Amino acid sequence: LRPNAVVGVRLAALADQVGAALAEGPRAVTEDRTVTGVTLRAQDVSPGDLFAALTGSTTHGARHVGDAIARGAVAVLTDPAGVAEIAGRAAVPVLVHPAPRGVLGGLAATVYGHPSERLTVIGITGTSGKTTTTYLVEAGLRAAGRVAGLIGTIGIRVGGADLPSALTTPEAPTLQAMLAAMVERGVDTVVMEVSSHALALGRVDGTRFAVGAFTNLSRDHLDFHPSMADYFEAKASLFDPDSALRARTAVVCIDDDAGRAMAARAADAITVSAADRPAHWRATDVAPTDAGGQQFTAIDPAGVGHHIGIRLPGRYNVANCLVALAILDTVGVSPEQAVPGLREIRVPGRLEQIDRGQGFLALVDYAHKPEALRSVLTTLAHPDRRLAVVFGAGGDRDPGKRAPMGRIAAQLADLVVVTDDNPRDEDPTAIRREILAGAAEVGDAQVVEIADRRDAIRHAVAWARPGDVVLIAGKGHETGQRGGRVRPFDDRVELAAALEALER
Numbered sequence: 001l002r003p004n005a006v007v008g009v010r011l012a013a014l015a016d017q018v019g020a021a022l023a024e025g026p027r028a029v030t031e032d033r034t035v036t037g038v039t040l041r042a043q044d045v046s047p048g049d050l051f052a053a054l055t056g057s058t059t060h061g062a063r064h065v066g067d068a069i070a071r072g073a074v075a076v077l078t079d080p081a082g083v084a085e086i087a088g089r090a091a092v093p094v095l096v097h098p099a100p101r102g103v104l105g106g107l108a109a110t111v112y113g114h115p116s117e118r119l120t121v122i123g124i125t126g127t128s129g130k131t132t133t134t135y136l137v138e139a140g141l142r143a144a145g146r147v148a149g150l151i152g153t154i155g156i157r158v159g160g161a162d163l164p165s166a167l168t169t170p171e172a173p174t175l176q177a178m179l180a181a182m183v184e185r186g187v188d189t190v191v192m193e194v195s196s197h198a199l200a201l202g203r204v205d206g207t208r209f210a211v212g213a214f215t216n217l218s219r220d221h222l223d224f225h226p227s228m229a230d231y232f233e234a235k236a237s238l239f240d241p242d243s244a245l246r247a248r249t250a251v252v253c254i255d256d257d258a259g260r261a262m263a264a265r266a267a268d269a270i271t272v273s274a275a276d277r278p279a280h281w282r283a284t285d286v287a288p289t290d291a292g293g294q295q296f297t298a299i300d301p302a303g304v305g306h307h308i309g310i311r312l313p314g315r316y317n318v319a320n321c322l323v324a325l326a327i328l329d330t331v332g333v334s335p336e337q338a339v340p341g342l343r344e345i346r347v348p349g350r351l352e353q354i355d356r357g358q359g360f361l362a363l364v365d366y367a368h369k370p371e372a373l374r375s376v377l378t379t380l381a382h383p384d385r386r387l388a389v390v391f392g393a394g395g396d397r398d399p400g401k402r403a404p405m406g407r408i409a410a411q412l413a414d415l416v417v418v419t420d421d422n423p424r425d426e427d428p429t430a431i432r433r434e435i436l437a438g439a440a441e442v443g444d445a446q447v448v449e450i451a452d453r454r455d456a457i458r459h460a461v462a463w464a465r466p467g468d469v470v471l472i473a474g475k476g477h478e479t480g481q482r483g484g485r486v487r488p489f490d491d492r493v494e495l496a497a498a499l500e501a502l503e504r
C-alpha cells in the first residue's frame with residue numbers, strides 16, 4: 001500500500017517548513033531536489049524518498065544512511081546525534097532538526113498531499129475493544145455501501161485487498177503513505193486503532209481525525225508510560241478541545257471512571273453507556289441468543305430505539321457496538337443501514353466463536369494479562385453450563401503476570417488447562433508451574449497441566465457438554481509457537497479441527 005501518483009515537494013520547501021539546518025551549511029542543491037515519499041526505515045526507501053534517520057531505544061537510523069542513499073533516497077532528516085553517526089559527507093543533503101520525530105508526521109502529510117483531508121479518518125483508542133470497535137464500524141460502512149479502509153493490529157483492509165502490519169498503529173510515514181494510497185484507490189472512510197504508543201510517539205501527527213473514540217481504560221502499558229496518569233494523558237491527546245490532535249467530533253464510552261473523565265475532557269463528547277448511566281446512546285433489553293450471540297435495543301440521542309443483533313458476547317461488546325453506532329451515525333450511516341453488517345461480523349481472535357457444527361460455545365480470545373482474563377471469564381460464566389479455559393504465558397517476558405493469572409482462572413473457571421504459549425528460550429515447565437501455583441487456593445475449579453498446546457485444546461473440547469463453554473486464550477489471531485523453531489500453530493484452526501474430529 002503505497003500510492004503511485006505522488007507529485008513531489010521541493011526539498012528546500014520541506015527544509016523551510018520544519019526550520020531544519022543543513023549538515024554542510026549555506027544549499028542550491030536543496031532548491032533543486034524533489035521529495036516524492038517519506039520513510040523511517042532504510043530498507044524501505046524508494047528513489048526520491050526523504051529518509052528519516054531517527055534515534056530509538058535499540059539503535060539509530062543514521063547508521064543506515066549508506067543503505068538508504070543506495071536505494072535512491074534524495075535526502076536525510078536526522079537529529080544532532082544523527083549527524084555524529086554520519087560524521088562528514090553523506091552524498092545527499094542532510095537536514096538536522098532537534099526532535100525530528102515531533103515533526104515527521106507533518107513532513108509526511110506534506111509530501112503525500114495531506115491525504116487525511118480527503119478522507120474521513122476515524123480513530124479509536126482505549127485499553128480494550130479498539131479492534132472489535134474498528135471491525136464493527138468497518139462492517140457498518142460496508143453494509144451502507146461506503147468504500148472503507150481499516151488499519152489496526154490484525155492488519156490493513158482496503159477494498160478487495162487485505163494485508164498485514166507490524167504495529168497496531170503504523171509510524172507516521174507509513175500511515176501517511178497508506179492513506180495517500182487509499183485516496184488513489186477511491187476509499188472514502190478509514191477506521192483506525194490509535195494506540196497510546198502511537199500518540200506518545202507522534203505516529204499520528206499529521207492526521208486529521210473526523211471522529212475520535214474512547215472505549216475504556218484499565219492498567220496496561222506501564223512498561224512504556226511512566227504512570228497511569230501518563231497513560232490517560234497520551235489518550236487524552238485525541239479529545240482535549242485545545243489539543244493539536246483533537247478529533248473533529250468525540251465519542252466516549254462512560255461506564256468507566258476513565259471514560260467519565262474523558263467525556264469531561266472532550267467537553268462535548270457524544271457519550272455512550274451500556275451500563276445504565278445516562279448517555280447519548282444507551283443499551284436496553286440485552287438478551288443473549290442461541291449461537292453465542294446477543295441482541296439489545298440501542299437508543300439514539302433523539303431517544304429512538306433500534307433493534308441491534310451482534311455475533312459477539314459480553315456486556316462490554318454491547319458497549320463496543322454502541323460506540324460503533326455512535327461513530328457510524330456521526331459519519332452518516334444510520335443503525336438501519338448498519339445492522340446487516342453488525343449482525344454477522346466476526347472479529348478475529350476477540351471472543352471469536354468457532355462453529356464447525358453445534359453443541360456448545362467454543363471461543364478463541366486474545367486475552368493475555370490478569371485484567372483482560374478477569375473480565376473475559378466473568379462475562380462468560382453463567383450459574384449453569386460450565387466454563388473451561390486453556391492458556392499459558394510467554395517465555396522471556398515479565399513473569400510477574402503469571403502468578404495471579406492462574407489465580408483469576410481458579411476462582412472463575414470450572415476447568416483450567418495450563419499449556420505452552422511461546423516459551424522461546426525459557427523452560428516450558430517453569431512457566432506452567434508458576435501459573436499452577438496460582439491455581440492452588442481452589443472451592444470451585446478443577447486445574448490440569450498439559451504442555452502440548454494441541455492436546456490441551458483437544459482435552460477441553462472432549463470435556464464439554466451441550467451448553468458448556470470452552471475458551472482458548474492468550475493468542476487470539478496471533479499464530480506460531482516459538483521454542484529456534486517457530487512451529488506452525490493457529491488457535492482457531494486447531495479447535496476447528498478438534499471440533500471437526502468429534503463423532504461417527
Ligand SMILES: CC(=O)N[C@H]1[C@@H](OP(=O)(O)OP(=O)(O)OC[C@H]2O[C@@H](n3ccc(=O)[nH]c3=O)[C@H](O)[C@@H]2O)O[C@H](CO)[C@@H](O)[C@@H]1O[C@H](C)C(=O)N[C@@H](C)C(=O)N[C@H](CCC(=O)O)C(=O)O
Binds near residue numbers: 055061169171198
Ligand atoms: C518501542 C517502540 O515503540 N518501538 C518501535 C520503534 O522502535 P525504535 O524507536 O526503538 O527503533 P530501534 O530499532 O532503535 O530503531 C532505530 C531507528 O533506526 C531505523 N532503522 C533500524 C534498523 C534498520 O535496519 N534500518 C533502519 O532504518 C528504525 O526504523 C528506527 O527508526 O520503531 C521501530 C520502527 O518503526 C518499530 O519497529 C518499533 O516497534 C516495535 C516492534 C514494538 O514492539 N512496538 C510496540 C511497543 C508498539 O508500538 N506497540 C503498540 C501496540 C500496543 C497495543 O497494541 O495495545 C503499537 O501501536 O503497535
Ligand SMILES: [Mg+2]
Binds near residue numbers: 126127220221
Ligand atoms: Mg493496549
